[PDB]
Amino acid sequence: SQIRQNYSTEVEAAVNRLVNLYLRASYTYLSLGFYFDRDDVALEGVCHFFRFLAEFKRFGAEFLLKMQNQRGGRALFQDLQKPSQDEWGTTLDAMKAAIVLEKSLNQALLDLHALGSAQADPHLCDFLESHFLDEEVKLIKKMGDHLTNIQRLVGSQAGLGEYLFERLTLKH
Amino acid sequence: SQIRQNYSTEVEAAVNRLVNLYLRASYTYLSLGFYFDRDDVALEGVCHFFRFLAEFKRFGAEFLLKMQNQRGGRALFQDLQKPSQDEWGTTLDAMKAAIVLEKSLNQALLDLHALGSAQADPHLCDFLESHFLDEEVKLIKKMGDHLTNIQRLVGSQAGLGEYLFERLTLKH
Amino acid sequence: SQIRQNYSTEVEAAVNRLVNLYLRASYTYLSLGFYFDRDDVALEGVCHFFRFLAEFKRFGAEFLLKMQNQRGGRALFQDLQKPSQDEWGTTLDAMKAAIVLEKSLNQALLDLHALGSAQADPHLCDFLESHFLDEEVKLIKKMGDHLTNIQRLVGSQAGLGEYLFERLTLKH
Amino acid sequence: SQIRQNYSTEVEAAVNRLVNLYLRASYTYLSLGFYFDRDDVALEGVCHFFRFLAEFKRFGAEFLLKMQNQRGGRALFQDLQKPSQDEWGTTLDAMKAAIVLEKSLNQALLDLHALGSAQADPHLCDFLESHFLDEEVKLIKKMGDHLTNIQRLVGSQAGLGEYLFERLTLKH
Numbered sequence A, B, C, D: 001s002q003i004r005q006n007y008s009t010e011v012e013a014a015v016n017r018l019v020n021l022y023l024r025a026s027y028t029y030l031s032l033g034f035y036f037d038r039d040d041v042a043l044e045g046v047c048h049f050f051r052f053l054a055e056f057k058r059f060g061a062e063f064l065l066k067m068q069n070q071r072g073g074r075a076l077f078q079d080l081q082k083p084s085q086d087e088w089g090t091t092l093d094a095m096k097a098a099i100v101l102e103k104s105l106n107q108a109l110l111d112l113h114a115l116g117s118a119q120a121d122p123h124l125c126d127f128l129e130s131h132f133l134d135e136e137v138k139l140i141k142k143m144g145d146h147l148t149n150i151q152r153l154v155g156s157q158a159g160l161g162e163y164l165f166e167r168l169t170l171k172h
């Protein structure tokens, strides 16, 4: 490449893997969103929360691909694994699965940041810091806040709590 | 001092003590606010109620300091004690602690008003009457209203009630 | 904690200590501001400079507390020591004390950045870089500029110079 | 009188005396204002400061007279003594004479407040508290601030300092 400078093959490959992880996360959120749109689930705010995250993770993948080309690396796409479940249980089950997924993406971001620091690639490090690390901490905090509110609403009237959370916390 | 007139050393010292009490109350409300922002507490309206009071009590301290200088007294600052708790329990526990704190500030206002009246300091008396006494009665009434609503919502579904109070009474 | 990830106990504790340092600095600036509002000091622009810094340092403390919760750490508050002086001397004395205070806060920021780098905590490092390190360098440069102008105005007519600096450099 | 209620002859007479004191103060400020308009004095900002106070004290007298009639007392006017000086010296001399005058008016306000309190006349007490006592404290603080700035500007270049104070502190 006529532009590539200070961009290791190790970083290039790890960026392609991170693109796959974000596209997989987007797919997981698409499945979560349409589960909550089922006529036998019918939680509009929950559907909208996860459909927004599906678009937000696709955006993250596209930002990584733009950066891959800016650095002179080569995008390489792999098969995208289907999500881990076909049915996602309750809002609580879904929000737990979402925070597990986000902690996995956050650890992948931290791992790539550590590789960039080891390879003295400050453009890679700054790119993650400026576009991903704080967005990810803020999303995980939001999901933790939601999990606590869902948990406090279960009590012995689980259906009432799940309705109220969707109506009074989530955007619909 | 070239301006000081009818301003006793007793009032000057009691004003400095009241500044300390208001700055301590502001600090207590800062701690209450950030407790309700914890991911394992997550009651946004409760966080906002106490963060507003932290700013409101700081304002009261600054108004007292402005008056101290207007009268020709000398601001003297003391160490600010940490709040009484690191964790504040439920919204009910927190709102009870807040009304105990406000009754303590109100008694300090009444004590300083009585000293000013004994020292025939009508500017001090009017300053408290016009800027503090009614604001304090109105805040205590608001907190009493909130305590009654929180208490009526406990029943046997405490988590549901605490969610509903935060969602439907407090500003978020 | 259900959200905490890559957030060491060492960083958590150092963040709480930095919150204390910023709240102490805010308190120091409150005392400086009201000293310059005394009828026997009466330098409005100097009062406003330090009152603005009192609010700016409180803001910094609140930003650290927000981040502490975003990361899943626990805010812990300590007693806030009174400022180092009750009377602050001349504008020159005050601006020297302010730059000593700011260099102490800047070294605390640099120390926490170095701890975050040692603990491979890039979110902490980016948070300080993006919200504190450049703001602090810019504030110290401004104070250095002011110290030089105050020093050039002393000559043998110190009162004239102190008036002129307040009138023609500081906002009133 | 068909309206008079709870309004002692002692208060009525003291209100008429206070009207005389405010009209005398207005006259003193008229003389101060026109002294600073002399071609051999020529300090426009100083002239404007004292001309504003002449109008402000006339206003205070008219507010007392309105209240005298509202209470059913009878305005009684006495001769208005000429001001204490025909020539007022420097801005410093003038601002010292002004603070002596204002402390005398403030003590008269405090004396009438104490008489009203002794006579259980709360309308009189509230009238002074709401319209006079804080305005007077604020004016005396402003004059003290000005005296300190004038004093710091004397040094060994008195004419330079007096020019600069008029140009850079007073409104012209």
Ligand SMILES: [Cl-]
Pocket: A081, A082
């Ligand atoms: Cl699979």
Ligand SMILES: [Cl-]
Pocket: B081, B082, C079
């Ligand atoms: Cl303590």
Ligand SMILES: [Cl-]
Pocket: B079, C081, C082
């Ligand atoms: Cl100390």
Ligand SMILES: [Cl-]
Pocket: D081, D082
């Ligand atoms: Cl006479």
